[PDB]
Amino acid sequence: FMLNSIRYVASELEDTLGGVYSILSQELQLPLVRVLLKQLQATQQIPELPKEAVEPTI
Amino acid sequence: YTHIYLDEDSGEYLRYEEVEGMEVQGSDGTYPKEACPYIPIRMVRLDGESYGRSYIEEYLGDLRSLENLQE
Amino acid sequence: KRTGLAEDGAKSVYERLKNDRAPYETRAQNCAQYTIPSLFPKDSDNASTDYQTPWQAVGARGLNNLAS
Amino acid sequence: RTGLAEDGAKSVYERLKNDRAPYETRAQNCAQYTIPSLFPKDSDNASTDYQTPWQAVGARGLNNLASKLMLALFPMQTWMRLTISEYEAKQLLSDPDGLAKVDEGLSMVERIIMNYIESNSYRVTLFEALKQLVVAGNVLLYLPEPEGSNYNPMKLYRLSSYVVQRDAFGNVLQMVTRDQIAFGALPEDIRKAVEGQGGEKKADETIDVYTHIYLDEDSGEYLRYEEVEGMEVQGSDGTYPKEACPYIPIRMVRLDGESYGRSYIEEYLGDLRSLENLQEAIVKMSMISSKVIGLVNPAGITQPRRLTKAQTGDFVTGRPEDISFLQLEKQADFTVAKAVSDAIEARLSFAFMLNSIRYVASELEDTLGGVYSILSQELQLPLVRVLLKQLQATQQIPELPKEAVEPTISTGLEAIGRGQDLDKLERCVTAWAALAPMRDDPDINLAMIKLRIANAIGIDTSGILLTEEQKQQKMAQQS
């Protein structure tokens, strides 16, 4: 449970111990960033004029 | 009750709200297959199973034994 | 008027699928009971219910630490 | 189809599933002794409880190995290098500035590969594949053809979903992948195909789709098609070269003859068995110890009724010796069991790197099991050989050098950080920084010394250092 332990508490600590925390980075983070976008984009809170690419989210 | 499902044809998710028997005409939103604002989550994904398998699920035996000893 | 997967109705599909959700609810209830029990109470559980604290008391700390 | 395909995808998959059984059984055993939920059985489904292992060290080691290999094979820094094979492009090149521009273009291609890998969430799928490899070394990673910019992560195929056929050399490949996609979500072509083959399919019932690729009986490449029910789908008729096949079967430990398998923890399965048995015995002895029984001697005078029906204090008639409690006398056996368990845990931890970038590879991670160099030819290169060609098929990394083939040398250890070129360049530049006080030293020739030390370092100074002709023409131009 990591009782006997940003970037060191992540890609390490909460990685070698905890199996995969990257499944919550593709199941919780990306989906939220992809809904916040297109929602803030349907409303006039972020610019909407890519016309170059689709600007992927990592 | 809010129910969203795949379009039987080559379509996107169809969303509607049912309160009591009949739906509400006001709620007829349709969302793309990509930007679905409901976002079901799963911690440990297993093929076949629709969801579940918490992290503490596979340490439940240790908790059982430790709690028995401490009791 | 609704097409496939929705002709019967939201209530009916929810009732049908709730039976397939039972094992996950039971395992979640067990995990909650051995860790902090108040997190995932049973459907019947309501006010006037006392959540006996686990003896081990390491599950609660581990859950809190993982969440943090 | 004919030539390894006349019978059909379903028939060949069923035939080859019998040769997959031993690997599945060994994988299931390894999963059971480590985290059991990782590799569930086919019969196993929801409503099944995975009894957690007693030893609880195989799971730790599995997680550590997966994380370490993922931090070594696929790191944050570029893990592949595009080489140019100098002296093959020099002959058809104007001045070393051209070579530097070619290297810059290769670096840009590497950066774009980084961008594509990170944008499609390849890291999660790679980590899952790596963990599956450690528990049961075999995974098939299908890379769909890019379509626009929408992310298309590789669809990981566990052992239970695919089969492979290999000859002694492994040259012969016949890979069949089974995927259960329910009608209503079936790709349009497959949806119409299944509807045409039969009548109406319920949106809930699962539909089995088989994708089979085989060597062309003649001097041909791999032939790919998708079969849903008896007859294939006219839409799927792709043909792929034997080099750039987007399915990329993986194996952790290769043994000649065997088509695949031999997970890493297979050889340590006996130690896991012994540790689990010892830990189970210890836990059960502890549970025995937990129970408390009051042994009262009949020959005594103490009566437990007056003991129970008495508050704190409340002097009672009796003798302390009469009341005794049962105890687990098995102590020395406990000590020897603990010693053996500690020894087994220590050896396993050394084997799983629990008792431990380049120090996370070369040393540690490539010394506690040499699999960082066998999985750099099975997972790293095949992925960069398919990712580059697809991204060339679309207009994302246009290549038109006409000089070399720009070979990929992923080979992490070889090119972890773009190779040891920055170190050589900084060392030679620092050396050239010296000798400045002795410029007014007519006895020595600065250029000779500089070139000699550059040769000693082995670095290429075709353009960095101006030769006699270059110096003379520069002086003439300056005038």
UniProtKB/Swiss-Prot annotation, chain B:
Subcellular location: Virion
Family: Belongs to the podoviridae portal protein family.
Role of this protein: Forms the portal vertex of the capsid. This portal plays critical roles in head assembly, genome packaging, neck/tail attachment, and genome ejection. The portal protein multimerizes as a single ring-shaped homododecamer arranged around a central channel.
Subunit structure: Homododecamer. Interacts with major capsid protein. Interacts with the tail tube protein gp11. Interacts with the terminase large subunit. Interacts with the internal virion protein gp14.
Protein name: Portal protein
From Swiss-Prot, chain C:
Family: Belongs to the podoviridae portal protein family.
Summary of subunit composition and partner proteins: Homododecamer. Interacts with major capsid protein. Interacts with the tail tube protein gp11. Interacts with the terminase large subunit. Interacts with the internal virion protein gp14.
Cellular localisation: Virion
TM regions (residue ranges): none
Provenance organism: Escherichia phage T7
Protein known as: Portal protein
Superkingdom to which the source organism belongs: Viruses
The protein's role, per its UniProt record: Forms the portal vertex of the capsid. This portal plays critical roles in head assembly, genome packaging, neck/tail attachment, and genome ejection. The portal protein multimerizes as a single ring-shaped homododecamer arranged around a central channel.
From Swiss-Prot, chain D:
Gene Ontology annotations for the cellular component aspect, listed alphabetically: viral portal complex
Pfam families to which the protein is assigned, alphabetical: Head-tail_con
GO annotation terms (biological process): symbiont genome ejection through host cell envelope, short tail mechanism; viral DNA genome packaging
Keywords: Capsid protein, Viral capsid assembly, Viral genome ejection through host cell envelope, Viral genome packaging, Viral penetration into host cytoplasm, Viral release from host cell, Viral short tail ejection system, Virion, Virus entry into host cell
Keyword Iron: no
Signal peptide: none
Localisation: Virion
Quaternary organization: Homododecamer. Interacts with major capsid protein. Interacts with the tail tube protein gp11. Interacts with the terminase large subunit. Interacts with the internal virion protein gp14.
Family (UniProt): Belongs to the podoviridae portal protein family.
Function: Forms the portal vertex of the capsid. This portal plays critical roles in head assembly, genome packaging, neck/tail attachment, and genome ejection. The portal protein multimerizes as a single ring-shaped homododecamer arranged around a central channel.
Protein name (Swiss-Prot/TrEMBL): Portal protein
